[PDB]
Amino acid sequence: SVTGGARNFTLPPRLETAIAKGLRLAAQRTNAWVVTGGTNTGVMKLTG
Amino acid sequence: SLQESGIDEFDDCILKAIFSSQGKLGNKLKQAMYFDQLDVAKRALSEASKNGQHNEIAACINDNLMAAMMHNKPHFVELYLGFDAKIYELKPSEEVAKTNITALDELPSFALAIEELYKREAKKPHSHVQRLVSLSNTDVLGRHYRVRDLANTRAYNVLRMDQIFARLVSKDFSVNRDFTIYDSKYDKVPGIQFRRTAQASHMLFLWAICLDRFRMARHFWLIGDQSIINALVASRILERLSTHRALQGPHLAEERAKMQHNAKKFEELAVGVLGECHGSDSHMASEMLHSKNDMFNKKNAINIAYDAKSLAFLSHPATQSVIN
Amino acid sequence: INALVASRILERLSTHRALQGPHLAEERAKMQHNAKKFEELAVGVLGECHGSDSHMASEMLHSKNDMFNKKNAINIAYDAKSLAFLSHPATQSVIN
Amino acid sequence: VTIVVQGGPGTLGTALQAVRQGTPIVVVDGSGLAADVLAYAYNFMHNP
Amino acid sequence: ADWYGHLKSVTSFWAVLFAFFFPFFVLPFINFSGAHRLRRKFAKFYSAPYTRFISDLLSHFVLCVVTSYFVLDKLEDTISAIEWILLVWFVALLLEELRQMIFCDGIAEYISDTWNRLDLIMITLFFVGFFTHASDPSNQDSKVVSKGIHAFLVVVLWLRFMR
Amino acid sequence: EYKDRPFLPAPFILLAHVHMLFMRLLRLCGVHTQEHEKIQDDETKRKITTFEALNTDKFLRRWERERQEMLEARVKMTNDNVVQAMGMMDQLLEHM
Amino acid sequence: TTFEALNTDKFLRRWERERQEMLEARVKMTNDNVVQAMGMMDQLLEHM
Amino acid sequence: YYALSKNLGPKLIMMMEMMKDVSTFVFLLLIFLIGYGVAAQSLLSPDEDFSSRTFIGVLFRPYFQIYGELFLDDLNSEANCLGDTPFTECSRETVRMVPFFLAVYILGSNVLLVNLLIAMFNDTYMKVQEAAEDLWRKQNYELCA
Amino acid sequence: YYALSKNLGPKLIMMMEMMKDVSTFVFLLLIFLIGYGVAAQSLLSPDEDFSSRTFIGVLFRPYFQIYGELFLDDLNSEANCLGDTPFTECSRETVRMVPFFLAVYILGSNVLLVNLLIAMFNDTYMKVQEAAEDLWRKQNYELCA
Ligand SMILES: Nc1ncnc2c1ncn2[C@@H]1O[C@H](COP(=O)(O)OP(=O)(O)OC[C@H]2O[C@@H](O)[C@H](O)[C@@H]2O)[C@@H](O)[C@H]1O
Ligand SMILES: CC(C)CCC[C@@H](C)[C@H]1CC[C@H]2[C@@H]3CC=C4C[C@@H](O)CC[C@]4(C)[C@H]3CC[C@]12C
Ligand SMILES: CC(C)CCC[C@@H](C)[C@H]1CC[C@H]2[C@@H]3CC=C4C[C@@H](O)CC[C@]4(C)[C@H]3CC[C@]12C
Ligand SMILES: CC(C)CCC[C@@H](C)[C@H]1CC[C@H]2[C@@H]3CC=C4C[C@@H](O)CC[C@]4(C)[C@H]3CC[C@]12C
Ligand SMILES: CC(C)CCC[C@@H](C)[C@H]1CC[C@H]2[C@@H]3CC=C4C[C@@H](O)CC[C@]4(C)[C@H]3CC[C@]12C
Ligand SMILES: CC(C)CCC[C@@H](C)[C@H]1CC[C@H]2[C@@H]3CC=C4C[C@@H](O)CC[C@]4(C)[C@H]3CC[C@]12C
Ligand SMILES: CC(C)CCC[C@@H](C)[C@H]1CC[C@H]2[C@@H]3CC=C4C[C@@H](O)CC[C@]4(C)[C@H]3CC[C@]12C
Ligand SMILES: [Mg+2]
């Protein structure tokens, strides 16, 4: 399950690619069922 | 902490949050096998063995061996042995259909897991297993020159691959199996919990001599008995896998050179056990090299090594003491 | 003298007449390896004798031995058949 | 496993119903808004 | 996979040579990787480049054996039919070398190979030797000078046969 | 070389040239029957470039792990970590 | 068979001792024990 | 019966794996032989009918000219060139290239392909001689069996 | 008296340890010699009684045909075959295999066993030449003694 701020998401790109690389290797190695919020703003857009 | 820790500590903190939850120990060891943290899962099983729980471990580790054989982790199948692993009680993922055969109905439900591992091994593209079964030209029970839906869905059973390895050593192997041992009625005899893993480990050793996995074949060679004879059988099966007829192109050649390298490692292992037999009681080692084998048609191990074509086993001083 | 006697006894143990089969051959190669270690030790003590007082080392190599029938150590090394002791510069200084 | 990345009040509500229903959480410190609040609360309470 | 094509991997030298020499015995060999089945069988068998390589080998070996019997035997007072067959042959090799001239990546990419320089040498010396013999057929000395040019021809034919 | 050859041997390759000249006279000229061509998709080539970029990152992570598995970098990081351990040990003494 | 099993265990203990006597495993365990010594040294500073 | 001794026993297996490189040298040598044989038998005998004697003339002298026996007196008698110098005053001018092709042939064969066979026999003797004693102990077991 | 110099002194010990490989080449060569000698002396002279002249005929020409001297004019005079080509019009047809066996023999000996002796002499010169100066200093002591 990923939770976070929808419309107030503002991060640096290096930290965003670090969280995206860690979540990409975790979702690749885990084969997990990811539950986020359904909307297209912020970290649910990033996890999508 | 994101900027104050490494990039490879994030799988450790997700697996620490996985081990924070309690009650899901097979899926916790499955995500420990996916995240490849061996010492953390060793600390988890050591803390569970220290606390006194064993029944959740004995429920978990049979599916953990099955998933660790399916996903190719040798250090995990080295680790789960020694904690009452019980190799013969493995269960497959799916259920095998009825094929109306009396020999196939006597398989005690781990042979279908070996056939599921062979079907998962043959599902990769450009695999040598599927081309070797397609160039074998044999039946479902492994009889030569007898070439159906049964012969296609059950094309990778363990008795057919046993007949392929029995033709792959020589013309005089004649491998024997006894699947009527695996029953609840044969429990009062003492030593049979040796024998019910050991031949069973030999079957997984034949799956680990098919897929070029050295560490798992070394570990099932450690678990099973008759180590010199199975090492020379391993060198002969890898030396006939190194040519066969499908590994003849330029695109497989380093792969078949890898076959030669594994073959060399098992023949070094055969010399080393006989090196320990040259270390003490060499008259007993000379009685061992003169002893007849029931896995062949009553030939000793020097004739087995000559049918293996193994130069290092023939050049040992104990074998040359028997020859001299 | 005892190191060259050790190299000659291990060099005659390396053939003799009983160590002639194929089943002892690495064992007799082990004999050659030990023999080489003692002849290196003989060179090294003479290497210390080439380190200081080489005229005293030349008097040592000209000295007669009571453990043989009055022959010096270069004849003992020739009866040992030791190539490294004959190739030392102190022994070649006595020979030259 | 629930991962809190930055966040707001409803992210703290999903963290509250994650902890009150027994789901373990991962809070990434140094990321932003509510994750520094949750990391400051856990580092104040349990970190020695 | 571009070399074998639709032939999988298990073929010998003598298997594709016996299937080349007998097209009716190709069909029992199973199809590797009613009328359309057998036709697509000899279409995918004869569309492979390995069959084109064994066709050019065997055809250049039939050339070198036939020009060895041409050069070692005596020439006639008129033009023999084996010389007409070698003339029509080398015209077909001259149209093949002009076909490799236009369908290439360049003039220098064609001529940078040693074999294209050598095959031009043998086409040039065969036309010099045939025009030397056919300038005057009823003279012994023209047969002597033509067999002298044809000796260099059969030397560079055997030296092309190393390809 | 043998991808572009017309198959028919040397004596009969002139009949294949007459057939190639007939296809050059018919097709890519007047009264053409059919011309065949193939073009790759953009999403397939995007899958090729993202697969190439992911294999480039997997090769550079595997080559970084294999470059740290050499003996020279192991002796170098052992030397620098022992020097940093003496610096933290000097902080421990000064604290004692 | 019991003599063969005891010589198999004596060969694998002697081969494990000879595999730890190589230079590569010695440099590897020297590197990991120096990294574990820096971790225990960081625990000693934080304790100071 | 040479497999009892430790010297001659690997030399047999070395001689068989040298005979494979001999067959490789046969496949390299037959091109230069038959090419210089058809060219030299055409230049020595023009306007002559084909028989088995022409096939003896393309097999006999090329093969034996690479071992050192040059037949230049017999080639001078065969080409019917008269003089104190062996090729000046011949009847036909095309037989004066009969040494010249021969020059190229022995530069093809006597100094080139033979020294390639010394190089393959040096690599063949290295590939035998690093593993000779295992082959001798295997043949000692085959003598016992 | 060559043991004083540093060059020729190891070359003597190298020549003696090459003469052991010469005796190895004698034991490899005598099989092909005597086999081609009995076969060639049987094919050249049929219906002839055994004497010492037959033993000279099995020892003389096989030995000297491996050094380059091929006796094909003397074999053509011995087989009594008449012609411009040396073996076409013979009296008996079994003498036309007298080159052919010879072909196999020099492929047995002139290009095979001799190049095996270059390979053993290269390994013999390596086993001497890594330890030459100790043998020279030992022979300097034997000159002094
Ligand atoms: N899921 C949403 N999508 C879009 N807008 C939202 C959402 N949730 C809140 N908003 C509005 O957008 C503004 C931005 O708030 P943020 O702090 O960016 O998001 P947050 O309030 O933390 O919402 C948390 C929500 O997201 C999910 O991760 C989680 O399930 C939680 O419900 C807020 O004022 C809020 O009114
Ligand atoms: C580039 C090279 C290879 C060209 C090939 C050379 C050959 C084909 C040519 C070049 C010179 C020619 C020779 C020139 C002159 C004479 C003298 C004449 O009375 C008989 C023919 C003879 C002996 C010719 C034979 C053919 C010949 C040898
Ligand atoms: C590549 C090399 C080894 C070529 C092989 C040599 C063979 C093909 C040749 C070389 C010399 C030839 C022989 C030369 C002379 C004669 C005598 C004649 O009356 C019959 C043919 C016969 C007996 C020939 C047979 C074939 C022969 C042995
Ligand atoms: C690339 C290589 C092959 C070059 C070829 C060299 C050719 C062109 C040369 C080299 C030696 C030459 C021969 C040497 C001498 C004579 C004698 C003369 O009375 C007629 C020409 C003739 C017979 C020559 C013909 C041409 C010749 C064969
Ligand atoms: C393996 C090799 C070295 C074979 C050894 C060669 C020996 C056995 C042979 C080769 C040539 C032979 C000689 C050839 C010619 C003659 C002349 C004759 O009137 C008496 C015998 C005599 C003198 C022979 C003696 C034996 C001989 C020297
Ligand atoms: C498989 C191989 C080694 C078979 C051995 C071949 C030998 C034994 C045979 C095969 C062909 C035979 C030859 C065939 C024809 C003739 C012509 C005749 O007028 C005299 C005998 C002669 C010359 C024969 C001699 C023996 C011969 C050479
Ligand atoms: C395996 C190897 C030894 C094959 C042996 C080849 C044999 C069978 C061949 C090769 C050369 C042949 C000879 C070549 C030419 C002639 C001349 C002819 O008028 C009679 C047969 C005779 C004498 C042949 C007999 C058979 C022969 C010796
Ligand atoms: Mg071309």
Residue numbers in the entry:
A (entry chain D): 146 to 193
B (entry chain D): 387 to 533, 547 to 723
C (entry chain C): 628 to 723
D (entry chain D): 291 to 338
E (entry chain A): 724 to 756, 787 to 916
F (entry chain A): 1062 to 1157
G (entry chain D): 1110 to 1157
H (entry chain D), I (entry chain C): 917 to 1061
Study text:
We investigated a TRPM2 chanzyme from choanoflagellates that integrates two seemingly incompatible functions into a single peptide: a channel module activated by ADP-ribose with high open probability and an enzyme module (NUDT9-H domain) consuming ADP-ribose at a remarkably slow rate. Using time-resolved cryogenic-electron microscopy, we captured a complete series of structural snapshots of gating and catalytic cycles, revealing the coupling mechanism between channel gating and enzymatic activity. The slow kinetics of the NUDT9-H enzyme module confers a self-regulatory mechanism: ADPR binding triggers NUDT9-H tetramerization, promoting channel opening, while subsequent hydrolysis reduces local ADPR, inducing channel closure. The structures of srTRPM2 exhibit a characteristic TRPM architecture, from top to bottom, a transmembrane domain (TMD) layer containing the ion-conducting pore, a signal transduction layer consisting of MHR3/4 domain and the C-terminal rib helix, and an ADPR-sensing layer consisting of the N-terminal MHR1/2 domain and the C-terminal NUDT9-H domain.
A cation binding site is found between the MHR3/4 domain and the Rib helix of each subunit, termed MgMHR. This site does not distinguish between Ca2+ or Mg2+ either and is unique to srTRPM2 as the key residue, E1114, is not conserved. Replacing E1114 with alanine eliminated cation binding at MgMHR, resulting in a reduced rotational movement of the intracellular domain around the symmetry axis when ligands were bound, as compared to the wild-type (WT) protein. The E1114A mutation had no obvious effect on macroscopic currents. However, single-channel analysis showed a small decrease in channel open probability and a small increase in channel close rate, revealing a regulatory role of this cation binding site on channel gating.
